[PDB]
Design a protein around this ligand. Sequence first.
Ligand SMILES: Nc1nc(=O)c2c([nH]1)NC[C@H](CNc1ccc(C(=O)N[C@@H](CCC(=O)O)C(=O)O)cc1)N2C=O
Ligand SMILES: Cc1ncc(COP(=O)(O)O)c(CNCC(=O)O)c1O
Ligand SMILES: Cc1ncc(COP(=O)(O)O)c(CNCC(=O)O)c1O
Lengths: 405, 405
Amino acid sequence: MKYLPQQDPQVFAAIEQERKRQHAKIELIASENFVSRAVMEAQGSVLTNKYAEGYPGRRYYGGCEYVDIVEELARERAKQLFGAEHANVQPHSGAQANMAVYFTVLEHGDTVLGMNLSHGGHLTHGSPVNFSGVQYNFVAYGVDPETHVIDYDDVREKARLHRPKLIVAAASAYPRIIDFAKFREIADEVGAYLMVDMAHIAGLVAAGLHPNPVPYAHFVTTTTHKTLRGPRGGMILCQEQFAKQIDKAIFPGIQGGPLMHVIAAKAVAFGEALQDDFKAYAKRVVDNAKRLASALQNEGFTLVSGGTDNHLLLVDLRPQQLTGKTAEKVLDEVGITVNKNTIPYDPESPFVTSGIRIGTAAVTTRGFGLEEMDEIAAIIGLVLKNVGSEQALEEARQRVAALTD
Amino acid sequence: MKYLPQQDPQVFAAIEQERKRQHAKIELIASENFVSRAVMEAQGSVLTNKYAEGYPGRRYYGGCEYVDIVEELARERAKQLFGAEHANVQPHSGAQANMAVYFTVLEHGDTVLGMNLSHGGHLTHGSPVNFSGVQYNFVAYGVDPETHVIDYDDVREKARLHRPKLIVAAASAYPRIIDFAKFREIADEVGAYLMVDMAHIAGLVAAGLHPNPVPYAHFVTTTTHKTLRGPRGGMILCQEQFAKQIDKAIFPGIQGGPLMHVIAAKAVAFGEALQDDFKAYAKRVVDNAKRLASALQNEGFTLVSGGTDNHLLLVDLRPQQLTGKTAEKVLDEVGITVNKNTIPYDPESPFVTSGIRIGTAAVTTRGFGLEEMDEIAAIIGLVLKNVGSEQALEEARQRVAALTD
Ligand SMILES: Nc1nc(=O)c2c([nH]1)NC[C@H](CNc1ccc(C(=O)N[C@@H](CCC(=O)O)C(=O)O)cc1)N2C=O
Ligand SMILES: Cc1ncc(COP(=O)(O)O)c(CNCC(=O)O)c1O
Ligand SMILES: Cc1ncc(COP(=O)(O)O)c(CNCC(=O)O)c1O
């Protein structure tokens, strides 16, 4: 950094603190990752200066000649990656992406079937304190009480009982592969659209390690920053019969000017995803996730669903008579960054919760493999099973320190 | 740029073309500007990797220690700048800022008084192809058909007729000062809330060159990238009495995790506006708009409202028999970037228009003064009064190139 340190030592100090913390801690938040320098250079570019309301070739402003190239690259690399018919790379968030789809297909008060929030569903899938749950009438479907796998009989029963205008599939915390085909079938049965929110698993879908929802859904929404390893932003993929409406939902509907600089970073992120070692990288996340789980089970921990088929895991903390809030706190001292997360049928609420959610995308990006996963679990065991021991804490500290050197 | 040109030649080439275009053309788009290198560096930082749903000290994730300072610098510097009691620096956009205000105070279908889109109002101030107009009952107030100044008598009439729950004040293409005192007076008569969208005029308000709306409005919304000269994003300003409700609207309401990297650049831009130099700048911005308006009228051009009191000016192109769309394309041919803009009581639709909107924020940023403004209007007169003349176009190009080097 050149001009920042000289003009804003306060902001620069904060960013340097953050740049060091990212290397110091062992980052297990499942949502997170670390982008390349190419990706940062694109969002730190001068594309922030351009107003480009509209779409490539159909803008509301002059001079969008070169910013149209960047959007088309993003769109055509996105279509190459997921094999969708159309792509909208302007959504600012995963939330704005969801909001735009819902905007396009639903009316105020329509009924929507989305995954139960404490079973794995996301905020924008029906929380009553989110716009989705205020704007629309969401009914939830859940996971099996003992296997913690989506109950497809439950999904079809809710579907037929509530007759939803659209069905949402996917999650923020479900460690198992989601069967898009059954979702498509149930929706056809009741004449509902299908929306797949692939945010968490988009990089895994991209590398062939998770079934692709594109062939089965009308609308596919994603973030560009979780397993896809891109800039913070959103994206909508859809059949070409919904394209004109999807694009109008984004603009002139819920958004204003896109973030061309972030759209250039999405373009770079997708570029990286199309390359062969992204497929390689993705396999290690999933392998590392598998390994981490097993290592955790060996330390005596209980995992919701018994393990994972993707990048994240959900620890049911109860048997260490722990809550997810203290677990989270405790590991933040020793350098492990996780996030408290409700568990299916959690006996407590989503402010305290009974578990921690963990993922390997970030550490895998920094080069950790199987044997370093074994140690992460070891340290989590040492720490969580001996919560007030200052000696356990400090031991934890050197071992984390030994991993991030 | 270090890694981009080697990682991604296709993206790098388009970013580089944009950069060249930004220097070679005369960027007159009124909502555009050029950010500092310090601002871009913050945007290209590692702060994009951090999930930070929540607010500083009240996150739903660990490791937010540094990002919390980033967000407090932005809020505290914003409050210094505009004297608000509370500030939300999380809106991804000016669209999302507005949406969060509406989500907090209005209930689906509620009646809102906003400025008409063709007399100057913004898309999110009631357009029927926008969520604002689809989600709420928007009635519009307009400008005098002769003097093109907001008709406060009209505002007050509609308020009493329609008794909205909220009155929106401000715009995208009004070139005169907005009297916030009368707006609040009217809102108070009819028991409505008053929200001011100062997106276009934040830098001026910050600099003491436009009456500040903060003391008259319950809510103040703004973008950070227009006359404020910050990164692309939004911000909400409000009285303590509404803060909690405003923060909840942004999250868990309408957004997900914030763009922490973008909040870092907002804090940088607020620091820059807090400096003494920024007041010099904004004074020149308006003086340049005054001089370019007068210069424009010397070449025969009619201006909506007779001139400008701010950073913006609107050309009614009817007298010279051209559409807004035609003027824009021709001016793009000689290297002058503007945007077609509807004009009050426009006989043309929003993609053709009978006018062009011009602003001096960005060219002032790049150092242009009074004499360059005389040249610009001369180059603009030359071109729009000789559209068929290829010899006129080449001359124009050279004068542009002489101005931008
Ligand atoms: N007064 C004013 N308000 C604004 O909100 C605004 C400006 N000017 N100028 C520039 C920028 C341009 N935005 C637009 C974008 C779409 C439409 C819109 O009404 N489109 C209609 C009909 C257009 C057609 O001819 O294709 C639609 O059907 O899409 C209008 C202004 N902008 C705000 O961003
Ligand atoms: C399934 C799913 N869908 C949308 C989002 C929204 O993203 P944002 O950029 O934050 O608006 C998410 C993000 N989840 C946060 C987390 O999992 O921690 C998501 O998982
Ligand atoms: C008055 C006014 N209010 C909000 C916005 C929103 O901005 P964005 O970041 O693009 O969502 C704007 C934007 N102006 C567009 C234009 O005037 O060029 C605005 O003017």
